[PDB]
Structure formats: structure tokens, C-alpha cells
Specification:
homodecamer; Heterogeneous nuclear ribonucleoproteins A2/B1 (chains A, B, C, D, E, F, G, H, I, J); mainly beta; 0% helix
Chain lengths: 54, 54, 54, 54, 54, 54, 54, 54, 54, 54
């Protein structure tokens, strides 16, 4: 539980993308049921030259 | 539970994207049921050259 | 439970995007039911060159 | 539970992409049921020359 | 549980891509059931000349 | 340009879903521009046992 | 250009789903431009036992 | 250009799914440009026992 | 251009799935460009015991 | 251009799956360009005991 001490940029404990997507369900389905699930594109992180040092 | 000490930028414990998306459900479905779920694109983080150092 | 000490920018415990989206439900559905759910694009974080250092 | 000490960039314990995608489910399905799941492209990390050093 | 000490770049314990994709399920299926699962392309890591040193 | 003559139901020239979605554009973009476009789920046709004959 | 004459159901020239999705564009892009496009699930046709005959 | 004459069901010239998806483009791209395109699942036709005869 | 005459079901000239997916493009790309394209699962036709005769 | 005359089921000129997928392109690419293309599973035809005769 100890973070980073030092550095030129010194990034921390960053959580960009995660979690449960349609997970951990308790399902009791009878006969004719539909449970679709659709997810779009996910971008987690640094984009377009981000977190750059001059 | 200790964060970052120091650094050139010194970012912290940043949570950009996460959580439960259609998760942790208790479902009892009988006969003809529909439970669709659609999610758009997700961008979590730094974009367009963000958090840059001159 | 201790935040960041110091740094050039010194960002904190920032929560940008999260939470439960259609999650943690208790559902008892009988016969012909519909429970759709649609979410638009989500942008969580820093955009357009934000949090930059001159 | 000890992070990085130092360095030229000093990146931390970054979690870019992860979590459960349609996982950890308890499913009791009877007769004619459909549970589709579709996920778009996922980009986790640093893109477009991000986290560069001048 | 000890991270990296030092270096020219000093990258940390980065988790780019992982987690359970349609895994760890408890499934009891009777008669005519469909549980498809489709995943798009996944890019985990550094792309476009990222994390470069001048 | 002649429609249907007869039948038990006698459906016509029905146009359910169509048209240009972000199409036929003339675009002159200079330098740093963004033109995103996101569309939700589209249902075109007859649903829930519609157009049934007793 | 002559439709259907007769039949037990006598369906016509039905157009359920079609058209240009992000098509037929004239694009002149200079330097750093983004033109993303995301489309949700599309259902075109007859669903849920539609157009049935007793 | 002559449709169907007769039959037990007498379906016509039905167009369920089609059209140009990100097609027929004129593109002049200079230097660093991104033009992504993502499409969800497409269902074209008759589903759930549709167009059945008793 | 003459359709079907008769039959027990008498299906017509049905077009279920087709068209140009990222096709027929005129592309002039210079230097560092990305044009990704991702398509989800496509179902064209009759599903779930559709177009059945009693 | 003459369809089927008759029969027990009398199916017509059905086009289930086809078309150009990333085809017929005119491409002039200079230096460092990426044009990926990914397609999901495609199901064209009759599924789940469809078009059955009692």
C-alpha cells in the first residue's frame, strides 16, 4: 500500500479502465428469454501524445 | 493506503474509468423477456496531449 | 487513506468516471417484459491538452 | 506493496485495461434462451507517442 | 511486493491488458440455449512510438 | 412502379429503416479537428409478434 | 417494377434495413484529425414471431 | 422486374440488410490522421420463429 | 427479371445480408495515418425456427 | 432471369450473405500507414431448424 517515491514524471497508482462489464450476475431464466449485451470501443490510457515531457 | 511521495509531475491515485456496467444483477425471468443493454464508446484517461510538461 | 505528498503538479485522488450503470438490480420479471438500457459515449479524464504545464 | 523508488520517468502501478467482461456469472437457463455478448475493440495503454521524453 | 529501484526510464508494475473475458461462469443450461460471445481486437501496451526517450 | 396486387395480408412497399447516417459529406479539415459520430441501436421492422393473422 | 401478384401472405417490396452509414464522403484532412464513427446493434426484419399465420 | 406470382406464403422482394457501411469514400489524408469505424452486431431477417404458418 | 411462380411457401427474391463494408474507397494517405475498421457478428437469414410450416 | 416454377416449399432466389468486405479499394499509401480490418463471425442462411415442413 505504498506508492511511488520519486522520478522524472512520478506517475501514481492510476486506474484507467476496468470494472465488471455484464459480470457477477445471478440469472434464473425460464423458457424464451433474451439478454443481449453490446459494448462500444473502449480507450483507456494516454492518447494523442499525452503525458509528454518537453 | 499511502500515496506517491514526489516527482516531476506527481500524479495521484486517479480512477479514470471503471464501475459495474450491467453487473451484479439478481434476475428471475419467466417466459418471454428481453433485457438488452448497449453502451457507447468509452474514453478514460488523458487525451489530446493532456498532462504535458513544457 | 493518505494522499500524495508533493510534486510538480501534485494531482490528488481524482475519480473521473465510475459508478453503477444498470447494475445491482433485483428483478422478478413475468411473461412478456422489456427492460432495455442504452448509454451514450462517456469521456472521463482530461481532454484538449488539459492539466498542462507551461 | 511497495511502489517504484525513482527513475527518469518513474511510472507507477498503472492499471490500463482489465476487469471481468461477461465473467463470474451464475446462470440457470431453461429451454430456449439467448444470452449474446459483443465487445468492441479495446485499446489500453499509451498511444500516439504518449509518455515521451524530450 | 517491491517495485523497481531506478533506471533511465524507470517503468513500474504496469498492467496493460488482462482480466477474465467470459470466464469463471457457473452455467446450468437446459434444452435449446445459445450463449455466444464475440470480442473485438485488443491492443494492450505502447503504440505509435510511445514511451520514447529523446 | 406497380405495387402488389393481392394476398392474404397484402403488405405494400414499406420502407422501415434507411437513409444516410453521417454520409455524403464534403469535409475540408485543417490541423486538429474531431468529428465523432455515435449511433444507438436501431430496430426497423415488425416486433413483438406484429402483423400476425388470427 | 411489378410487385407480387398474390399469395397466402402476399408480402410486398419491403426495405427493412439499408442506406449509407458513414459512406460517400469527400474528405480532405490535414495534419492531426480524428473522424471516428460508432454504430450500435441493428435489427432489421421481423422479430418475436411476427408476421405469423394462425 | 416481375415479382412472385403466388404461393402458400407469397413473400416478395424483401431487402432486409444491406447498403454501404463506410464505403465509397474519397479520402485525402495528410500526416497524422485517424478515421476509425466500429459497427455493432447486425441481425437482418426473420427471428424468433417469425413468418410461420399455423 | 421474373420471380417465382408458385409453391408451398413461395418465397421471393429476398436479400438478407450484403452491401459494401468498407469497400470501394479512394484513399490517398500521407505519412502517419490510421484507418481501422471493425465489424460485429452479422446474422442474415431466418433464425429460431422461422418460416416454418405447420 | 426466370425463377422457380413450383414445389413443396418453392424457395426463391434468396441472397443470404455476400457483398464486398474491404474490397475494390484504390489505395495510395505513403510512409507509415495502418489500415487494419477485422470482421466478426458471419451466419448466413437458415438456423435453428428454420424453413421446416410439418
Amino acid at each position: 500500500g505504498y506508492g511511488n517515491q520519486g522520478g522524472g514524471y512520478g506517475g501514481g497508482y492510476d486506474n484507467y479502465g476496468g470494472g465488471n462489464y455484464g459480470s457477477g450476475n445471478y440469472n434464473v431464466f425460464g423458457n424464451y428469454n433474451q439478454q443481449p449485451s453490446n459494448y462500444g470501443p473502449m480507450k483507456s490510457g494516454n492518447f494523442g501524445g499525452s503525458r509528454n515531457m518537453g
